[PDB]
Amino acid sequence: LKGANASAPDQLSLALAWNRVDIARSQIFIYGQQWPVGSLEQAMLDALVLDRVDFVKLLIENGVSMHRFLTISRLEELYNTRHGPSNTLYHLVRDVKKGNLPPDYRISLIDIGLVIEYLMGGAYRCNYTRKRFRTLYHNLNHFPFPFHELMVWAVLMKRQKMALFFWQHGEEAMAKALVACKLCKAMAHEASENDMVDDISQELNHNSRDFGQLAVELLDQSYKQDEQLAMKLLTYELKNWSNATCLQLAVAAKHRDFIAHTCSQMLLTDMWMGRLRMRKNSGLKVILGILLPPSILSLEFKNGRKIYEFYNAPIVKFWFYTLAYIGYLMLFNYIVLVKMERWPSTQEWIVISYIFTLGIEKMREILMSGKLLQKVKVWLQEYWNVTDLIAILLFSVGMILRLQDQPFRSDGRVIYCVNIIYWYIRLLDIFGVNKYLGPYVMMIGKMMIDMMYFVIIMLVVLMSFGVARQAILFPNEEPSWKLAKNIFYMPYWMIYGEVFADQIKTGAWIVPAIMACYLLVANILLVNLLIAVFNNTFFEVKSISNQVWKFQRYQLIMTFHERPVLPPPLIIFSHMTMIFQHVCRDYGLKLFITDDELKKVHDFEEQCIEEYFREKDDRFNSSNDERIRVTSERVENMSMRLEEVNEREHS
């Protein structure tokens, strides 16, 4: 350093190339360096592209401000760098632009915006691709929040340490954490798709998990410090992130631990109750108000209009739907239990109208979900929708078959009797709203597989025994389909307690012996093994079911918020209201705030993140391992120094 006798930027560039930070910290930055104008920003630009976190921090600590350093041109140069680790940004750019780019193509910010909008999802709209920024970029500045763009650049080019450094500086920490988690997950999926080296597809998941964990910890700290501001922080519209709340970003990232937190559950409950203040005992008083409009005004509403405000709460819509479904179920049971006429009765017409309205409402919902084929795939991703379609189509073919000749009328009635089982079963979906009946239904769904894996072996043994017995006892049977019935019927009824020693020839005495062996195998070994399997695979299953139910509460709440007020049996009136209005989210989705509240919330979040980092450092420096290691190092150094001291002999 002192041998070159050059300017300060040359020594700084040497130290930057050597990646020796303490030498620059001690030897370079000294009393009155007299830095030339523009040298520090050039050194910052050089340190960014070489992935030197320590040097970027050191230059920030000594007068370099990102609000003046960062421009459009410098960010563009950052996105086209080559003196860094490997990244998959170019392949994503090629895939978005469909490989039309010439070799050595110059990336632009519009391309990065297209990549972001492709990675995030469907409704996302990056700030780069808006018209104002395209106009400002065509005719050619400043960046109001530089750390947002720096964090996005660090995440996209797969530089984790730089991303973690840029995360803690600036405003909207939780939004940045959630967006980074979603981007890392999407890039992991994209790299796993296009047969990459496969280390990327297992490092990007690590980055996503780290960012999700940071978001959860920050939310926990904010909720511990103050509840009202934490809830206000989870709902206000983020102007810089395509107009979404933090909750929507968490849901789109499929982050289950964020929604399952207590703060999110309280916020979702407060969305569920709508404008009603009742918390101590709901449900029965809700249906009281549904049945008694005079009882509505005796309730309490948060800050004439009370009826309209009451009917728009999600809980009232849910209870109205439940009552309508129960009434329809009762009418269905009544019309299948009594004799069927040549022409349908009134209750049958009510049932048919309900089914038709439900079907057209479902098809309208699938028609309001861009390209036609993609909405179908998204909407058929759920088993309930598929079962509803199958049941509705079968009921329609029954209706067609029911208004025909007498044998066809009987066949239609039989198809109604078979179809009523699904509408009786589907009450489990309504029960899933309950805090205790949801996890048990999910647990049953998960144990179905373990039940099937033993049903297979039970069928094997049962068929073996049935064939053996039927072949021993009946030796002169002409080939008929009756033979295929005696294989399975009796040996299946014999394991449910209906064993008939009276109903069980050369070698006829082997039948009771094989029957005893079959009973001892099927009704003792397999059943108790299944009990053991259900017992020892229960704790993890119930914890997973609880987590999944807490996650799906949000989807249920949004589904009933979008729902029209009227129940399906009389939804026809509102099903034609939008027809005339076609040619003619204040709360429950977001929470619009002013500038002063925005600034207060930003300062609150900054204080929370600073406190969290300080607490983490204080906890780490007081653990036993750190104290042991530091004590050992200091003892060794002291021992060497004392050996040096006793080495001297002035006597």
Which tokens is 321 given? 């739907």
| Helix %, strand %, coil % of the chain (to 5) | 70, 0, 30
Return the closest-CA partner of residue 474 out of 511, 520, 446: 511
- Residue 646 binding partner per list another protein, a second copy, ligand 9Z9, none, with a CB distance cut-off of 5 to 8 Å that depends on partner kind: a second copy
Query: Which stretch in 123-131, 399-407, 481-489, 525-533 sits in contact with ligand 9Z9 by CB under 6 A?
Result: 481-489
Rounded to the nearest whole angstrom, what is the least distance from the CB of residue 488 to ligand 9Z9 in the complex?
9
Return the closest-CA partner of residue 110 out of 90, 139, 131: 131
Contact in structure between 467 and 487 (CB atoms under 8 Å):
yes
Please identify which residue in 31, 343, 481, 500 interacts with ligand 9Z9, judged by CB under 6 A.
Answer: 481
Which tokens is 612 given? 């969290």
Contact in structure between 110 and 134 (CB atoms under 8 Å):
yes
Nearer to ligand 9Z9, 386 or 418 (CB): 418
- Residue 643 binding partner per list ligand 9Z9, another protein, a second copy, none, with a CB distance cut-off of 5 to 8 Å that depends on partner kind: a second copy
Contact in structure between 330 and 354 (CB atoms under 8 Å):
no
Query: What DSSP element (H or E) covers 56?
Result: helix 53-60
Count Cβ atoms within 10 A of the Cβ of residue 372 and give its class: 0-12 exposed, 13-18 middle, 19 or more buried: exposed
Query: Which stretch in 217-225, 475-483, 508-516, 588-596 sits in contact with ligand 9Z9 by CB under 6 A?
Result: 475-483
Strand partners, 236: 591
Does 100 engage in binding with ligand 9Z9 (CB under 6 A)? no
Which tokens is 451 given? 């039940």
> Three-state DSSP class for 166?
helix
CA distance 323 to 358: 15
The identity of residue 136, as a single letter, is L
- Residue 194 binding partner per list ligand 9Z9, another protein, a second copy, none, with a CB distance cut-off of 5 to 8 Å that depends on partner kind: none
- Residue 142 binding partner per list ligand 9Z9, another protein, a second copy, none, with a CB distance cut-off of 5 to 8 Å that depends on partner kind: none
Does 417 engage in binding with ligand 9Z9 (CB under 6 A)? no
Site residues for ligand 9Z9, 142-181, by CB under 6 A, read none
- Residue 481 binding partner per list ligand 9Z9, a second copy, another protein, none, with a CB distance cut-off of 5 to 8 Å that depends on partner kind: ligand 9Z9
Please identify which residue in 37, 197, 291, 337 interacts with ligand 9Z9, judged by CB under 6 A.
Answer: 337
Nearer to a second copy, 596 or 625 (CB): 625
Does 484 engage in binding with ligand 9Z9 (CB under 6 A)? yes
Does 479 engage in binding with ligand 9Z9 (CB under 6 A)? yes
> Annotated binding residues, as ranges?
282, 435-436
Does 520 engage in binding with ligand 9Z9 (CB under 6 A)? no
Nearer to another protein, 460 or 579 (CB): 460
Nearer to ligand 9Z9, 107 or 463 (CB): 463
Does 483 engage in binding with ligand 9Z9 (CB under 6 A)? yes
Does 334 engage in binding with ligand 9Z9 (CB under 6 A)? yes
CA distance 230 to 154: 28
- Residue 330 binding partner per list another protein, a second copy, ligand 9Z9, none, with a CB distance cut-off of 5 to 8 Å that depends on partner kind: ligand 9Z9
Rounded to the nearest whole angstrom, what is the least distance from the CB of residue 473 to another protein in the complex?
21
Contact in structure between 83 and 49 (CB atoms under 8 Å):
yes
Rounded to the nearest whole angstrom, what is the least distance from the CB of residue 257 to another protein in the complex?
23
CA distance 155 to 261: 26
- Residue 336 binding partner per list another protein, a second copy, ligand 9Z9, none, with a CB distance cut-off of 5 to 8 Å that depends on partner kind: another protein
Does 197 engage in binding with ligand 9Z9 (CB under 6 A)? no
Query: What DSSP element (H or E) covers 364?
Result: helix 346-367
Nearer to ligand 9Z9, 337 or 373 (CB): 337
> What is the CA 588 to chain-centroid distance, rounded?
19
Whether the CA torsion 365, 369, 370, 375 is positive or negative: it is negative
Phi and psi (nearest 5°) for 461? -65, -40
Nearer to a second copy, 508 or 630 (CB): 630
CA distance 402 to 342: 9
CA distance 372 to 366: 9
Contact characters 237-276, ligand 9Z9, x per CB under 6 A: ----------------------------------------
CA distance 92 to 111: 10
Nearer to another protein, 220 or 411 (CB): 411
Rounded to the nearest whole angstrom, what is the least distance from the CB of residue 459 to a second copy in the complex?
22
Which tokens is 546 given? 């609880």
Rounded to the nearest whole angstrom, what is the least distance from the CB of residue 420 to ligand 9Z9 in the complex?
10
- Residue 613 binding partner per list another protein, a second copy, ligand 9Z9, none, with a CB distance cut-off of 5 to 8 Å that depends on partner kind: none
Does 480 engage in binding with ligand 9Z9 (CB under 6 A)? yes
Which residues make up the interface to a second copy (CB under 8 A)?
A: 622, 624-625, 627-632, 634-639, 641-646, 648, 650-651
CA distance 600 to 98: 45
Query: Which stretch in 208-216, 238-246, 328-336, 363-371 sits in contact with ligand 9Z9 by CB under 6 A?
Result: 328-336
Report how many residues bind ligand 9Z9 under the rule CB under 6 A: 10
- Residue 480 binding partner per list another protein, ligand 9Z9, a second copy, none, with a CB distance cut-off of 5 to 8 Å that depends on partner kind: ligand 9Z9
CB atoms within 10 A of CB 569: 18
Contact in structure between 96 and 108 (CB atoms under 8 Å):
no
Nearer to ligand 9Z9, 334 or 592 (CB): 334
Nearer to ligand 9Z9, 68 or 485 (CB): 485
Query: Which stretch in 3-11, 22-30, 476-484, 524-532 sits in contact with ligand 9Z9 by CB under 6 A?
Result: 476-484
Nearer to another protein, 476 or 536 (CB): 536
CA distance 286 to 292: 10
Does 476 engage in binding with ligand 9Z9 (CB under 6 A)? no
Query: How far is residue 236 from each of residues 82, 231, 233, 268, measured CA to CA in Å?
Result: 39, 9, 6, 14
DSSP-assigned states of every residue in 444-506:
HHHHHHHHHHHHHHHHHHHHHHHHHHHHHH-----S-TTHHHHTTHHHHHTTTT---STT--T
Buried b / exposed e along 220-246 (16+ C-beta atoms within 10 A): bbbbeeeeebbbbbbbbebeebbebbb
Which residues make up the interface to another protein (CB under 8 A)?
A: 333, 336-340, 407, 410-411, 413-414, 416-418, 420-421, 424-425, 427-428, 436-437, 440, 443-444, 447-448, 451, 455, 489, 492-493, 496-498, 530-531, 534-535, 538-539
Return the closest-CA partner of residue 408 out of 312, 317, 340: 340
Q: Which residues bind to ligand 9Z9, rule: CB under 6 A?
A: 330, 333-334, 337, 479-481, 483-484, 487
